[PDB]
Amino acid sequence: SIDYNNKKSIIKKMYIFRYLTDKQCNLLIEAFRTTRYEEGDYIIQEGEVGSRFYIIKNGEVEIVKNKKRLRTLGKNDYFGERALLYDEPRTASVISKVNNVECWFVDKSVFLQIIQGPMLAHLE
């Protein structure tokens, strides 16, 4: 309940999901799962092909390129959205800034199956 309503509230108001149907959105909310990181963990590694999208539940992360911090993201911020449409190398790294970081994430595998929904044929 609480975790569902939590990510529901965030997901539903996000720009990048504004075209989803309520049916799609519900599948999507249920598809997100929590993942935990400790201080200094690489959440995303620059140069790898991205396949996940992340929303910060607890904590902070930093976006890093060429060992330089580009910015800090905190609770309810999100990152990695291009991976949900494009198959391309990550342009930067994302590093867990503190212990006990928690993100909701979804893989493009799951997301695309959901976006595909309206293309699936009815019997009648």
Residue numbers in the entry: 403 to 526
Article, verbatim:
The final model containing residues 403–526 shows four ordered sulfate ions, with one of the sulfates occupying the cyclic phosphate site due to a high sulfate concentration in the crystallizing condition. The N-terminal portion of the αC-helix (residues 520–526) forms a loop, providing crystal contacts with the PBC of the neighboring molecule in the crystal lattice. The rest of the αC-helix (residues 527–542) is not modeled due to the lack of electron density. The αC-helix is not ordered in the absence of cGMP, but becomes ordered upon binding cGMP and shields the cGMP pocket. In the absence of cGMP, the PBC is open with its αP-helix positioned away from the -barrel. The αB-helix, which interacts directly with the PBC, is tilted away from the -barrel. The α310-helix of the N3A motif interacts directly with the PBC. Three phenylalanines from different regions, F419 (α310-helix), F434 (αA-helix) and F455 (3), together with the hinge residues, L486 (αP-helix) and F513 (αB-helix) as previously defined in the CNB domain of Epac2, form a hydrophobic core that stabilizes the apo conformation.
